[PDB]
């Protein structure tokens, strides 16, 4: 959020176990966000795009309201990392102590597949909001809608892979169905919607 | 450029300011891929279980390294290279011919940046795979979310290639530029599916 690039990439880089998958999902996610608001922003206003105009108002708020949640989910990434290995990291000697860590474990894995599910359901967002200036976008930038639905598309599935990693560990085997099943649709659509909105862009620009 | 704070790109990024653009953005969609082949890499050198592929990750290590210097070095190549289009068709009949040539020169570097960042993500999906296959079990996913990362930066860049091979007069240029283009493309999309489904059936 409030940190550097070049800061962020070094951490990225580092051995530190964060910024990690998760928290780059994130910033693909905001990045398709961004490139939304984008072809909003050079479109609305341009006398030419006046019978759009309303519609790609009405995008702008929403790509505004997921730029935002998706920065803050730079650092949900971290909370829930902490959540996990500040549980499997509990004194384990009486059975007091494993009884309350095996509990404590199972909520940390049921959070670690809520934040990451919750950036999926945001990225799978973002691509509906792509579509949209892909087909209303001035054509002078109507590769940023382009770019906008890759970084989306890139969001999703990097932030699914959290989804599944965390997801397996649970013992409530229903919570997971519901949250995979969730995951499972999210991604169904997402493949040839990203294809479609990312080759429309392809021949808009020749 | 990478100077700046990541809220600080995404303000510009989002706004109707020509720069930052998906130009931007695919610089750095490729540098995170570097960063977290590089980080697979940090967490599988030096665990004794991992001796095995130690001195090969040393070795993919420097690489994904220089890599994402390249790549964060390449958010500011974007920037220039854009601004320097936007500057010759803001030029004012010898006025006229002036302006159609500083605007094919400015073209034909926005048309090579975009290709260079092209060339480097697509390293970027090969080492993505070696570690793929020989990193830490435990940071697994990070493998994946790399080849998405450099898998979107290789077509969002792909792209920019585009837009500006289209107005270009010198059009022996243009089409190897292309073919180059298309060479990159034409792998990207079969090994990016590989190597997630495998970082896929690692994490299940």
Known sequence: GNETIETFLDGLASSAPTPGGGGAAAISGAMGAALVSMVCNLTIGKKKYVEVEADLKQVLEKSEGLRRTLTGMIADDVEAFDAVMGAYGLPKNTDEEKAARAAKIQEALKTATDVPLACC??????????????????????????????????GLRSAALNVYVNAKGLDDRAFAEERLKELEGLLAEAGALNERIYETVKSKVN
């Open 121 to 154: 359901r945001v990225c799978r967002e973002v691509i509906d909001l792509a579509e949209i200036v892909a087909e209303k976008g001035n054509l002078n930038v109507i590769s940023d809608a382009g770019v906008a639905v890759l970084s989306a598309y890139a």
